[PDB]
Design a binder for this molecule. Sequence first.
Ligand SMILES: CC(C)C[C@H](N)C(=O)O
Ligand SMILES: CC(C)C[C@H](N)C(=O)O
Ligand SMILES: CC(C)C[C@H](N)C(=O)O
Ligand SMILES: CC(C)C[C@H](N)C(=O)O
Ligand SMILES: [Mg+2]
Ligand SMILES: [Mg+2]
Ligand SMILES: [Mg+2]
Ligand SMILES: [Mg+2]
Ligand SMILES: [Mn+2]
Ligand SMILES: [Mn+2]
Ligand SMILES: [Mn+2]
Ligand SMILES: [Mn+2]
Ligand SMILES: [Mn+2]
Ligand SMILES: [Mn+2]
Ligand SMILES: [Mn+2]
Ligand SMILES: [Mn+2]
Ligand SMILES: [Zn+2]
Ligand SMILES: [Zn+2]
Ligand SMILES: [Zn+2]
Ligand SMILES: [Zn+2]
Lengths: 440, 440, 440, 440
Amino acid sequence: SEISRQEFQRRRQALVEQMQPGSAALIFAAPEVTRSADSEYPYRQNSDFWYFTGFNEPEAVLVLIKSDDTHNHSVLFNRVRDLTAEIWFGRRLGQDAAPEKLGVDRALAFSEINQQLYQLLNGLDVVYHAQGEYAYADVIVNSALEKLRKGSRQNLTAPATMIDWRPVVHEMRLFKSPEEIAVLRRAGEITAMAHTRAMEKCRPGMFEYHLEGEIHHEFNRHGARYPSYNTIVGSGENGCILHYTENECEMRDGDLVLIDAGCEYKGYAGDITRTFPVNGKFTQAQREIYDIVLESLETSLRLYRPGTSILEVTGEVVRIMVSGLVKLGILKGDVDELIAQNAHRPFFMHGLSHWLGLDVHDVGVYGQDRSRILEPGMVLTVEPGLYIAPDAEVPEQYRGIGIRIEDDIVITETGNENLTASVVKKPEEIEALMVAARKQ
Amino acid sequence: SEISRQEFQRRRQALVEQMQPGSAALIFAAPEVTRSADSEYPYRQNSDFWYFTGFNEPEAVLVLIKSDDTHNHSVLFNRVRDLTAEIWFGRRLGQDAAPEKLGVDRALAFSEINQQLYQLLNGLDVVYHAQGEYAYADVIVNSALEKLRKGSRQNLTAPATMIDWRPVVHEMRLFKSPEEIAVLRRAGEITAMAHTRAMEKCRPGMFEYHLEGEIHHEFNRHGARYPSYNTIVGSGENGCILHYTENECEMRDGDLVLIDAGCEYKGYAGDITRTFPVNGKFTQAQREIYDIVLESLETSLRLYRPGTSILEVTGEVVRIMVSGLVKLGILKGDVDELIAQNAHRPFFMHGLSHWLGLDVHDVGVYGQDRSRILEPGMVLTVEPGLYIAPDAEVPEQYRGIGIRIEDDIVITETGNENLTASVVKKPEEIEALMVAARKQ
Amino acid sequence: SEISRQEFQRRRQALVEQMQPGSAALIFAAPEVTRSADSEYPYRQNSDFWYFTGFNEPEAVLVLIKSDDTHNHSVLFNRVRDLTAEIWFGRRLGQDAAPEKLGVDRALAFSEINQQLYQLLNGLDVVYHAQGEYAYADVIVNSALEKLRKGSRQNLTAPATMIDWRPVVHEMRLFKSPEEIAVLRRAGEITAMAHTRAMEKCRPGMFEYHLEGEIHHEFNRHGARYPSYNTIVGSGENGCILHYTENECEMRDGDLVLIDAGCEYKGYAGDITRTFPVNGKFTQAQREIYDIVLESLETSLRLYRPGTSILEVTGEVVRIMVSGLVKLGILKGDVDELIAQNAHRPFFMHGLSHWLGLDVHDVGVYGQDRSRILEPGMVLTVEPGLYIAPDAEVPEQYRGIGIRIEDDIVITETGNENLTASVVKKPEEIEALMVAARKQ
Amino acid sequence: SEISRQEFQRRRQALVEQMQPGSAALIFAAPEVTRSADSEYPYRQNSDFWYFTGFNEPEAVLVLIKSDDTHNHSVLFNRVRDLTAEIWFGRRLGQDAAPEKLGVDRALAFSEINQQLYQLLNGLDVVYHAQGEYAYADVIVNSALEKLRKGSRQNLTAPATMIDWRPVVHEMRLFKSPEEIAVLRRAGEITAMAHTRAMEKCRPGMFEYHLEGEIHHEFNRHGARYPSYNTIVGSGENGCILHYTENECEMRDGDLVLIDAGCEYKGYAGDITRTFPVNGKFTQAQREIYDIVLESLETSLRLYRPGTSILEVTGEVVRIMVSGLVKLGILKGDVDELIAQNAHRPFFMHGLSHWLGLDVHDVGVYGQDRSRILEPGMVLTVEPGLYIAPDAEVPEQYRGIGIRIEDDIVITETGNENLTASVVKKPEEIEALMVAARKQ
Ligand SMILES: CC(C)C[C@H](N)C(=O)O
Ligand SMILES: CC(C)C[C@H](N)C(=O)O
Ligand SMILES: CC(C)C[C@H](N)C(=O)O
Ligand SMILES: CC(C)C[C@H](N)C(=O)O
Ligand SMILES: [Mg+2]
Ligand SMILES: [Mg+2]
Ligand SMILES: [Mg+2]
Ligand SMILES: [Mg+2]
Ligand SMILES: [Mn+2]
Ligand SMILES: [Mn+2]
Ligand SMILES: [Mn+2]
Ligand SMILES: [Mn+2]
Ligand SMILES: [Mn+2]
Ligand SMILES: [Mn+2]
Ligand SMILES: [Mn+2]
Ligand SMILES: [Mn+2]
Ligand SMILES: [Zn+2]
Ligand SMILES: [Zn+2]
Ligand SMILES: [Zn+2]
Ligand SMILES: [Zn+2]
């Protein structure tokens, strides 16, 4: 799946709809990022710029100008074509091909932006700019506005009003279109196939990073070159570290391994966590913790629908967690009192859910304590976990156990669709899968 | 292989040896680098900081203080231990364990650097600082020196002399120790195994990125998680782009594919290029260009030794290239005149060799036109290539052909050692390998 | 005369009237300014901050918060009291006395502004800030807004809208109240007494700076310690330089001297120019140029009234100038054609009038080519001049003559009031004054 | 008196003498400084730039290049000539006239400094730069050094060593030449004539600022347009504030007035303090404090010579002060014990002496607690004072009395020369002077 030309057009128009007449919105591309010396990390476009363009070059600026309710036009600034630069570092779109390729009305050289931008902002009332996002963008915008302020004898005027467009754009990004949902659905399948593969390949004596290698290879072969975040493979006590990315340890028979990994497919994030036995068989103690996390997930999956919230579903999970932990002797006391004291927090210290999209921890207003009412089109994770520290004052058998199980869902009219259920999570299904792989 | 504790100690002492008495050298860690929103790229330590420490954390500063010819000591600034931060993002060394772990005399909290650094620089004559390397480092250093300048009533004095240590340190990095050569030898083997694998896996109808996926998986399984640079897989006309990294095209029967890829193993770069037929059989036209590049490489490999230079060996390659091209009718005229006119440049527009080490394009003075005399311990690439543009005014059969063949070598007492010869480059050996893989 | 407490209150309320509900306006004091090393120039408060406060300290910020149409309050940030700092450098208002002294509701320590400002802006929709005015102010404001943006888990929100209040405030400053007009009236008298004195003291063999000394002494004795701008005393050819401030030359019998000087009284600028003979007697050639400039001024003074403009009155002056210059043989041709060609520009190359107030070249929109229609309450200068370069291709007797005559006026309901007519400008009155002084 | 062309030449050569071979010293002019809006404070040249040039323009850079022990040359960057800019704002030196006028070998346009400076620094080993002095200078220098670092393929190299020249230059400035001493001698006379005049003009009912007006007029008429610092006229309790510059109060019969004021003559500072009765007659209580301060000054004047120090002479003053204060009942106890407890500090809380020159508080190393041994050519102030707070717990008659008496001296071979003794300080001579003036 992919995002159509028409969809990028619709998004631009949906932003323009919300803009004041006599205004311009300025959306800047991400800068190139150094890895070491003259070498750079693989380019990752700014998510908001990407959202309006699907264009993967640096040194580009989308300018949307609204004259009134029925009159608007777009200007792109982008890199000029340069045979020497293109022989060395790769092909560029240029100005001639840009209007047709990206559906903009006009394309200018980025090298001329300081000569041109003030002319576009001259006489407008409002400029929409995400101030503080990038230093290079702020220099450009401020420089343009100073030219206009100081240029009254050349009959120039600056817009006196500057508005951060991020609240508006992130509110748009919070609600996925059918096209976006289709892309995220594929990202979920890709990510699930990778997690299945990691389970099937895992053996004692392999390193954590070996499973990372399997996962990234699987992402790549479906056309997701990059992960959406740094892959986490925490075996044993490493599972109690939420974003453990060292992935350096030999995986030991008897330990669990926690894998949090997600592909980036057409800009969109998958985000799955599966925890399983390194040797393919859960111990009793491991099952006892696993079952609590699985019940939390399965119950959350049932409950999530329009009209509830992350906060409200979290309350049900806290109850399941505190109850399970009291039965195992990990907590002691009255369940309701323990809940009132948030006695689960030493063992579950993060949120159940986050928004998901062009960023793995996606943009959009959560409301106080993530109390915002859910509506169709919102996409989020469901990731309960229990992390018992190596030195927790609890029965010995639970110490050093970290388990998270995470699915990705989209809120529908009547409930939710699970995008990541094609990778198993019931312990008997995990064991069967691993057994079948070891034979083969 | 790896770098020993003792080696890191030797390097620090070799820097201190060259420093003036009453001086301090300040070496800063790389900052963390954003990929998108709150997500960050996998951390890559600054090569110079790494060279003296093997320490892979941000927010760290190595301070080497030389009192005189026989008196010096070291201070590390590094992140304090923080249970919440460590539960979330991973374990930290801290101050208690640092002296023993990294062989420094003293370790302080990085959060106290502004309270502490001026005290360390107070009364010294010279400070060694790589000004302009990092903005955060410059703020810290300048702030310390201002405190000292303005603090004469508190009996403070600033060192009046600031010296860039990079020339000195990069000159050290230019000459590899036996330990470094052993590590680079392993990086070369790992990288070669990956290139062999790409050749064996290649089929028509696969995408360029599929071969990238194979290569990265191979790097990872030998314990090189990351490439040293963004992998290049240019099939067909994409081969004429030197750092083509889009890797997005379906590979076509009849085309060549050029793969430039290198692992990062213990900080050190492999860097191999192999070009081969997608369908496993070179055409006549492809062989005719390939043979010229292979002769250039084989001849360069024979010639490289102490006492020659990149410039001098390049002159021999230019002759081979111009001669081969005249015989094919790609160039026309007298060979010596064509050489004098640099008539090869449209087809070979980069350098034959670059330094290799902790950076793929490694530090160290080349001399004018890379004329510096080679000595034992220098490590460099040997990468002739010919790139015939799709629209070159040459016989049709050569258009759109890009071929590079690149090996990594270390200059020895009597010649060089080739680190990357375990992956084949003779066309008959390439074909045999691919045939054997297709059977299977 | 002075500005009352009530007037400062009215101005604040007039700004708040124009502000959106759920907004805050931030007005910053001027920074202290270095003259050399640890010594500083006499403090000059920012004109806009002064306009709302009459408060002459640095490190102060006026915050006006509008909740709705009937609810607003003010917060001052200012320097805390400090006995050591006050023994050394002078008394401070502090927080306790500020509410009563400056009629603000609340006063906080400026040293706590970063801990406090974000709390004041939290949850507002709009912030009024003159971005780019001062770097220290921008750091403070941006820092506050970043705290709010990043603090959603602490239930913080930033105002998305930032508005430059300068257009609004400068439009207010453009129209003087009766109190302001009374103060400017006194500034005009003070400045006129100083110019009279300079005429009476002038003798051949005195230096240009001696007349500056007389002028500044006169300003000071009426309680205007500082000039509103750097005093200009251009004798001879120095008169052809518009802002000649070297004032270094011996004044010569036979030359004219041009004095442009103005006091600063309660923040408000006087601005007078008088040109007169060093020896107290105009030559024929000097009179011939002087009379043209005087007619231009006298005619402009008659014409200026509500409904005309600087542009329109300038057109009448250009006609007077071109006509006078043609009669002297300084210009040649048809008067109307010469006017159409702007043939006066080599000799009159600046504007006839500028706004006058808290700045000598005062704030306020002029309109294209200063075409804005004049209304009662606007205060402006009237300063025609003719400057014949030493090397002009004109009759010898006019070369090196610079003459400007400048008055300050306030537009009234029926015309204008001249604030600076208490110093003579008719040549016979100038001569009589100088004669009487020499006896002284 | 003035500084000769030859002297500026000698100073440049004295700096070059101390520089390493293969080096360049960069000395930048002061930036122009805003007073309000588009108006600027009278230009004050940077003291170090002035010291080497006597050149009073902004946007100028002196570059001194030392090839070896017998080969050096100079390059000036300065503003280009511009008829429009010169008609408006004043004449400029330009490039053609600069070599002859300022004795430099070469003059280039300041607008070309970024195109030219890196070429001058290319291939040098050392650059002398006062980093942090001016932000505009740092941008220029850093930009040049980055061009050189990154330009190795254009055969460019940056000097690796940067040295702050300020310690060296300020050590030069600490020792005045005969020419400088002659200029400072005239500054002292001018300043003394101004203080005499203030005493003669003072009457009850005049304001503090009126005496400022007299002082500045006197400075100006001898050709010292500007004061070296903001003039202090503290009558009554205002005398207990060390740098009281409000000068806003009506001077009252019965009070003392403390005047600290100094001219700037050819860049050099006068610095005199005299305290005297507003009504021309010291009271008993006023005499009792005055006599202690006068004895401190007279004794210090006798003691100051080569081989002593500010610290050592201060110890004698502390003894005089503590003894006088015990006799008046302002202090209580054993004199030696009171001295050991620094019991004088509430009443004398500043230093006895500071260096004097191109800055009023002049450059140069003082040593710990101003213990540096004095040598011929050092110029310094001698300014004991006693400041009894309005609320001091001392006999009523001493409360609110601030007295300082300050002279300027130059250390000679056998003692010192007093530059400011032409204004009276003995109380009977003060009274006689004021009596004679009142008749006026
Ligand atoms: C950053 C957040 C939106 C998500 C994170 N996993 C948390 O629960 O805290
Ligand atoms: C950057 C250089 C050292 C290497 C690069 N391949 C070139 O030949 O230009
Ligand atoms: C800056 C302007 C408002 C005034 C100036 N005298 C001019 O006529 O150009
Ligand atoms: C700044 C110092 C050199 C001088 C000042 N009067 C003091 O005694 O503290
Ligand atoms: Mg266990
Ligand atoms: Mg072909
Ligand atoms: Mg004449
Ligand atoms: Mg008294
Ligand atoms: Mn996850
Ligand atoms: Mn997640
Ligand atoms: Mn390569
Ligand atoms: Mn290479
Ligand atoms: Mn004027
Ligand atoms: Mn004017
Ligand atoms: Mn003084
Ligand atoms: Mn002094
Ligand atoms: Zn996460
Ligand atoms: Zn390369
Ligand atoms: Zn002006
Ligand atoms: Zn002082």
